[PDB]
Amino acid sequence: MKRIPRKTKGKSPATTEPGTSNREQYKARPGIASVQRATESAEMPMKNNDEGTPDKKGNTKGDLVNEHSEAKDEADEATKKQAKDTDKSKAQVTYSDTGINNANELSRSGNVDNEGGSNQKPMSTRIAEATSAIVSKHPA
Amino acid sequence: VDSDEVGEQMEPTFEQAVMEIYKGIAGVDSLDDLIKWVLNSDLIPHDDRLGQLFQAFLPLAKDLLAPMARKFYDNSMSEGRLLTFAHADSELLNANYFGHLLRLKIPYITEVNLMIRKNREGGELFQLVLSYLYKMYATSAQPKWFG
Lengths: 140, 147
Prior knowledge:
By secondary structure, chain A is an all-alpha fold. Chain A has three helices and no strands. The relative contact order of chain B is 0.16.
């Protein structure tokens, strides 16, 4: 039997024919290694964006920030990452402080639940308080 | 007197300090990682990452090697006239060296002379990076032929 592990946590006669000699004198142009490292980065899938979505408990995850503010901060993070990738103090290509007045741009955040309400209090906490206001105890 | 003679005056020589520089760079966790980061598979510095290598390395040299070199040369002059070898003239300039100063070059590829020379301590590629760092450390002056 062959067993394969999981990458994710689960529920729980002369034989020297005359053409085989090696005479490698060819240097690939462009080089193999360079293009290999280049395509290695493009291979990678785009990152997940879980923020703003509920979890198994029902409470949405993410940060409690205004969505406009998170859009701006998230653009700034991208600019910083671009600068780091280019190995310069400045990023030559910027995602923020452009000429475009993208003031109305919104981005997903953990601030707003699926009902359009605010996450000032976790959803499970709201359910608990609502259900605990009706309980009755044994008679005196 | 050999160029490296100043190196072992300190119990941790200059070379292991250069090796330990890597801890000051984000995204690098080992000297090997530093080597594969700074070179582009053709033994060429990326001409930018070597920038931050110099950024980190220069304070080490100018704050540790220079004073000990100053004392070493001061004592060395006492025994009499000597032939002194160095790797970059700025070493001698910053050490306030006394005597005739000569910058000499060679009709060879010096860089290839390293990685064939086996039995290296930190790996040959480290020696290549070190040589590049010294060459960047040198001043702007035309070196005469060694002959």
